Ligand binder design. Structure first.
Ligand SMILES: [Rh+]
Ligand SMILES: [Rh+]
Ligand SMILES: [Rh+]
Ligand SMILES: [Rh+]
Length: 129
């Protein structure tokens, strides 16, 4: 599924991401924009042989099992394919564990390089929330 900006903002807010560990909803929408362009089906291969899955590009190195990432963890206890669903529940609940892991949203290299220190509020401008 390809979400609208305000549609994803609304689903992320319903799932408790607005100010989760102090990250305003605009941070999460910005992250999803540069990770997946709001596409739940987005997949991208990493140099280490792991793969990033779904609207928040959650990696198989630590967070999910894709059956092909040797010496990896499954800390969200999910198949990586669950991160590709039209239902973002699994991505959101996994994201909450990731952001809690010690490095906050710096876990998302695209957040650090494209969202951190910017006017992230712009990402939810005009939405009914
Ligand atoms: Rh939902
Ligand atoms: Rh808020
Ligand atoms: Rh709010
Ligand atoms: Rh509201």
């Amino acid at each position: 599924k390809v979400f609208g900006r305000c549609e994803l903002a609304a689903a992320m807010k319903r799932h408790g991401l607005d100010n989760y560990r102090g990250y305003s909803l605009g941070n999460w929408v910005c992250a999803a924009k540069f990770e997946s362009n709001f596409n739940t089906q987005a997949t991208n291969r990493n140099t280490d042989g792991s793969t990033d899955y779904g609207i928040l590009q959650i990696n198989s190195r630590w967070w999910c099992n894709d059956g092909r990432t040797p010496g990896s963890r499954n800390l969200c206890n999910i198949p990586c394919s669950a991160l590709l669903s039209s239902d973002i529940t699994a991505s959101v609940n996994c994201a909450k564990k990731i952001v809690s892991d010690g490095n906050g949203m710096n876990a998302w290299v695209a957040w650090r390089n494209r969202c951190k220190g910017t006017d992230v509020q712009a990402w939810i401008r005009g939405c009914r929330l």
